[PDB]
Amino acid sequence: LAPLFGLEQDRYMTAQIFELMGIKDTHKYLLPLEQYQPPEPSPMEILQLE
Protein backbone atom coordinates (compact mmCIF):
# COMPACT_ATOMS: atom_id res chain seq x y z
CA LEU A 1 0.00 0.00 0.00
CA ALA A 2 3.02 2.33 0.14
CA PRO A 3 2.73 3.26 -3.58
CA LEU A 4 -0.56 4.99 -2.70
CA PHE A 5 0.53 6.24 0.74
CA GLY A 6 2.59 9.02 -0.78
CA LEU A 7 3.94 12.09 0.98
CA GLU A 8 0.78 14.21 1.08
CA GLN A 9 -1.27 11.48 2.77
CA ASP A 10 1.36 11.03 5.48
CA ARG A 11 1.51 14.81 5.90
CA TYR A 12 -2.27 15.02 6.28
CA MET A 13 -2.22 12.19 8.83
CA THR A 14 0.50 13.86 10.90
CA ALA A 15 -1.29 17.20 10.63
CA GLN A 16 -4.54 15.66 11.86
CA ILE A 17 -2.67 14.10 14.79
CA PHE A 18 -1.16 17.49 15.60
CA GLU A 19 -4.53 19.25 15.40
CA LEU A 20 -5.73 16.62 17.87
CA MET A 21 -2.75 17.48 20.10
CA GLY A 22 -0.95 20.60 18.82
CA ILE A 23 -2.83 22.93 16.49
CA LYS A 24 -0.18 25.18 14.91
CA ASP A 25 1.99 22.88 12.81
CA THR A 26 3.32 25.52 10.39
CA HIS A 27 5.03 27.38 13.24
CA LYS A 28 8.16 25.28 12.74
CA TYR A 29 10.25 23.19 10.33
CA LEU A 30 7.25 21.43 8.77
CA LEU A 31 6.28 23.29 5.63
CA PRO A 32 2.94 23.42 3.76
CA LEU A 33 3.26 21.05 0.82
CA GLU A 34 2.30 23.87 -1.55
CA GLN A 35 5.74 25.48 -1.10
CA TYR A 36 7.79 22.27 -0.64
CA GLN A 37 10.25 22.11 -3.51
CA PRO A 38 11.77 18.68 -4.23
CA PRO A 39 15.17 17.81 -2.77
CA GLU A 40 18.33 18.62 -4.68
CA PRO A 41 20.14 15.37 -5.57
CA SER A 42 23.73 15.07 -4.36
CA PRO A 43 26.87 14.43 -6.43
CA MET A 44 27.26 10.96 -4.88
CA GLU A 45 24.56 9.20 -6.90
CA ILE A 46 25.63 11.22 -9.94
CA LEU A 47 29.23 10.01 -9.80
CA GLN A 48 28.02 6.49 -9.00
CA LEU A 49 25.88 6.51 -12.15
CA GLU A 50 28.88 7.86 -14.07
Binding site: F5, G6, L7, D10, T14, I17, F18, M21, G22, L30
Partner: protein
Protein backbone atom coordinates in the same frame (compact mmCIF):
# COMPACT_ATOMS: atom_id res chain seq x y z
CA UNK B 1 -2.56 43.95 15.19
CA UNK B 2 -5.54 44.93 13.05
CA UNK B 3 -8.93 44.15 14.66
CA UNK B 4 -10.50 43.40 11.27
CA UNK B 5 -7.72 40.85 10.74
CA UNK B 6 -9.00 38.70 13.62
CA UNK B 7 -11.58 35.93 13.14
CA UNK B 8 -15.02 35.58 14.73
CA UNK B 9 -16.28 33.41 17.56
CA UNK B 10 -17.86 31.02 15.05
CA UNK B 11 -14.36 29.62 14.41
CA UNK B 12 -12.85 30.07 17.90
CA UNK B 13 -13.41 27.36 20.49
CA UNK B 14 -12.64 28.25 24.10
CA UNK B 15 -11.34 26.16 26.99
CA UNK B 16 -10.98 26.85 30.71
CA UNK B 17 -9.72 25.11 33.85
CA UNK B 18 -6.16 24.43 32.69
CA UNK B 19 -3.80 22.67 35.09
CA UNK B 20 -0.38 24.25 35.72
CA UNK B 21 1.56 21.15 34.63
CA UNK B 22 -0.25 21.06 31.27
CA UNK B 23 2.73 22.85 29.70
CA UNK B 24 5.02 19.98 30.65
CA UNK B 25 2.36 17.58 29.38
CA UNK B 26 2.39 19.31 26.00
CA UNK B 27 6.19 19.09 25.98
CA UNK B 28 5.97 15.34 26.49
CA UNK B 29 3.47 15.03 23.65
CA UNK B 30 5.76 17.13 21.47
CA UNK B 31 8.82 14.97 22.05
CA UNK B 32 6.67 11.90 21.45
CA UNK B 33 5.58 13.37 18.12
CA UNK B 34 9.25 14.11 17.45
CA UNK B 35 10.14 10.42 17.68
CA UNK B 36 7.22 9.66 15.37
CA UNK B 37 8.32 12.16 12.74
CA UNK B 38 11.84 10.76 13.09
CA UNK B 39 10.65 7.26 12.14
CA UNK B 40 8.92 8.36 8.92
CA UNK B 41 11.14 9.77 6.17
CA UNK B 42 8.39 10.65 3.68
Amino acid sequence: VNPKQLPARHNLQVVVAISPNEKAERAQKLISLKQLIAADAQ
